[PDB]
């Protein structure tokens, strides 16, 4: 029956979106747990697209039994979601190359997600609008994923194996790891249950696609814009946490409440603006260009919203907190006598508002146990929690949240037009190949690369490493400058190309 297939496919869309969100929100926890850099985390993130690419070319040439193959794909999604959860049981207790299992689980999840989109619409249109409703129901998945991630990032990583009354660290600390594994396991089981109710010439067209200058210009433009979007959304949680002193759970919840309603209303507003005012193709291009310009201006607005580097004695200041400075920092007399491994990540700030690296490096000699230190020579009383962010950074964070809402809304309106502004410029009998080649280019060159080379620069901005393991303190000014300048340099040539596109598209003959 068609109704049963519709329900099963809706559940499959929900599971796909939930798995994507679960993977996206857990990245920083993976970096902390496995002591890996952000470039490696970006590689793990792009392994999903790698797995999708390894199998999309096959399905694109074979159709067999579509419901059975979709069920197999969702089963592989669940298996990949659980494989990534397995290192929790296969590892020891977290202490404040196992990431290969996470990488392969993400790859398996991508291989499983590949069948659902093409085979689903093939079965939908073969036996009989539906795609929009399916996307609307799949929009439920992000909701569930964001809620579960926000709930699980505030539960300790070793929950159920420790008494939890002995955990010294807090979610606001830079060593906290949540229960990301649970989120992954829940997504895996949901995908498995979604799987259950299921088993019940060319190169000449390729040349033409390229010989089309408008198609090539639009492909480069969409590639740049989508790469910027992917590189921004991959590290938006991490950037918020490391820039505005927010916990992982709070960041996940706030980014979810920012994204879900905005995306839900943008997917509709962008497609309603065209049909309501009867936009021509050049009108659609101008619409998308204006949305891109507004988004670019808002991205420019992020630059003044950069909180300064925290006053840390040893990285941004001298060890006594007297002068400013981050490598090979010399020892002050008050600190030289109390020698320390010079590598003790023990965030403990002083009432001076200056964070110190460790109680030994702060010159503290006595401890209360809430922990308070006494007779800290170079602190001129301490507190084990590192000094938090300043009101000014809090107001900047509020402005950042508002601008993020507006930017997310504008992004959806601009995106919906893109696909509609890449097929209407291609022959009707060749639109399928145009969509497929555009999908391969954007998914490969953005999903596989943008996380990696964004994370490489992010690591370049790091100021304190663990063990190198996971970054401890990020240079906030450098972090913001790199994280926003990369997006700006990816979006500006896209704008120059848009005008070129508008300049060239207009003079064309349109029937």
């Amino acid at each position: 029956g068609f109704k049963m297939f519709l329900a099963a496919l809706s559940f499959s869309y929900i599971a796909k979106a939930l798995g994507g969100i679960i993977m996206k929100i857990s990245i920083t926890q993976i970096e902390r747990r496995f002591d890996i850099s952000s470039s490696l985390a970006g590689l793990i993130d792009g392994s999903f697209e790698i797995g999708n690419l390894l199998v999309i070319v096959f399905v694109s040439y074979f159709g067999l039994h579509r419901p059975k193959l979709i069920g197999i794909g969702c089963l592989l999604m669940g298996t990949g979601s659980i494989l990534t959860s397995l290192p929790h049981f296969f590892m020891g207790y977290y202490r404040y190359h196992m990431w290969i299992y996470v990488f392969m689980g993400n790859m398996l999840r991508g291989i499983g997600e590949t069948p659902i989109v093409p085979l689903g619409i093939s079965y939908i249109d073969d036996f009989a609008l539906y795609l929009g409703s399916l996307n609307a129901i799949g929009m439920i998945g992000p909701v569930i994923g964001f809620a579960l991630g926000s709930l699980f990032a505030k539960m300790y990583v070793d929950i159920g194996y420790v008494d939890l009354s002995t955990i010294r660290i807090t979610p606001k600390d830079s060593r906290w790891v949540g229960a990301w594994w649970l989120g992954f396991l829940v997504s895996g089981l949901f995908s498995i249950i979604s799987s259950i109710p299921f088993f019940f010439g060319f190169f000449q067209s390729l040349k033409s696609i390229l010989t089309n200058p408008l198609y090539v210009i639009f492909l480069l433009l969409t590639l740049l814009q989508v790469s910027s979007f992917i590189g921004s959304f991959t590290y938006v949680f991490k950037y918020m946490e490391q820039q505005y002193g927010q916990s992982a759970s709070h960041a996940n919840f706030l980014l979810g409440i920012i994204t879900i309603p905005t995306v839900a209303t943008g997917m509709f507003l962008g497609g309603f603006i065209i049909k309501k005012f009867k936009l021509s193709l050049v009108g659609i291009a101008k619409f998308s260009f204006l949305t891109s310009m507004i988004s670019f201006l808002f991205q420019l607005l992020y630059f003044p919203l950069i909180c300064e580097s925290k006053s840390v004695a040893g990285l941004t200041l001298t060890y006594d907190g007297n002068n400013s400075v981050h490598v090979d920092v010399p020892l002050s007399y008050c600190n030289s006598e109390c020698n320390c491994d010079e590598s003790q990540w023990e965030p403990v700030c002083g009432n001076n508002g200056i964070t110190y690296l460790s109680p030994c490096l702060a010159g503290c000699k006595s401890s209360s146990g809430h922990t308070v230190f006494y007779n800290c020579s170079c602190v001129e009383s301490a507190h084990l929690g590192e000094c938090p962010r300043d009101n000014t950074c809090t107001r900047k964070f509020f402005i950042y949240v508002a601008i993020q809402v507006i930017n997310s809304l504008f992004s959806a309106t601009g995106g919906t037009t893109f696909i509609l502004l890449t097929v209407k410029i291609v022959q009707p009998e060749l639109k399928a190949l145009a969509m497929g080649f555009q999908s391969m280019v954007i998914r490969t060159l953005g999903g596989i690369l943008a996380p990696i080379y964004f994370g490489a620069l992010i690591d370049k901005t790091c100021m304190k490493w663990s063990t190198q393991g996971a970054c401890r303190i990020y240079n906030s000014v450098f972090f913001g400058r790199v994280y926003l300048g990369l997006s700006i340099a990816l979006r500006f040539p896209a704008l120059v190309l848009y005008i070129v596109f508008i300049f060239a598209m207009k003079k064309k003959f349109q029937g």
Partner: antibody
């Protein structure tokens, strides 16, 4: 080296498929237009099509019995007639708009008049 | 959308000024073209208010808003053919009547 060769002109009692093979320019950023010239009469526009997409334009006299297509790979454009009554016995030209070739970027400009025509096929009814 | 040339037949000598004027009745736009069609040949684009490359510097086009006019400084024996003014809008192509000799 822009060329536009038309072939397919023959006596018909009716239907006929005529072609406008192109060369010397990027076919994708171009358009093809058919012009009818009755013997002793003036030029008359018949149909038009864009090569980058499926966009077509048609004339009032020929809408319900004239079809125009284009094969990008073949680098040619095609025109179809049906129900050939005794009023389409003219000579058929094929023409393209002007194309600018700054660097390797090729784009047409409809504001510019046809800069390259065809020889023409005589259709007899 | 529609353009018509009143002069049509126009006889003149070697040293003479030729003026061909046609008016855009509907949907006026600056996209006007001038074609010279020798008997039994394909038309040739001349004015289109800019000189096409390879055309001698004696053809000129002008317009006051509706009066599109093609002028020849001297009528040489080599341009005793028919002339057409052409409106090339988007999705629409129209032609005049024809001005010969």
């Amino acid at each position: 080296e822009v060329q536009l060769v038309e072939s397919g002109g023959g006596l018909v009692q009716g239907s006929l498929r005529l072609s406008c093979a192109a060369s010397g320019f990027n076919f994708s950023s171009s358009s093809i237009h058919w012009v009818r010239q009755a013997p002793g009469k003036g030029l008359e526009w018949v149909a038009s099509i864009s090569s980058s997409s499926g966009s077509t334009s048609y004339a009032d006299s020929v809408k319900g019995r004239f079809t125009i297509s284009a094969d990008t790979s073949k680098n040619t454009a095609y025109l179809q007639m049906n129900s050939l009554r005794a009023e389409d016995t003219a000579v058929y030209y094929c023409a393209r708009y002007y194309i600018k070739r700054w660097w390797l970027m090729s784009w047409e400009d409809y504001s510019m008049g046809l800069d390259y025509w065809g020889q023409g096929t005589l259709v007899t009814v | 959308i529609q353009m018509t040339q009143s002069p049509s037949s126009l006889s003149a000598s070697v040293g003479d000024r030729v003026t061909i004027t046609c008016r855009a009745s509907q949907s006026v736009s600056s996209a006007v073209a001038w074609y010279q069609q020798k008997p039994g040949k394909a038309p040739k684009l001349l004015i289109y208010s800019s000189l096409y490359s390879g055309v001698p510097s004696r053809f000129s086009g002008s317009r006051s808003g509706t009066d599109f006019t093609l002028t020849i400084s001297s009528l040489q024996p080599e341009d005793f053919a028919t002339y057409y003014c052409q409106q090339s809008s988007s999705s629409l192509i129209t032609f005049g009547q024809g001005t010969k000799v």
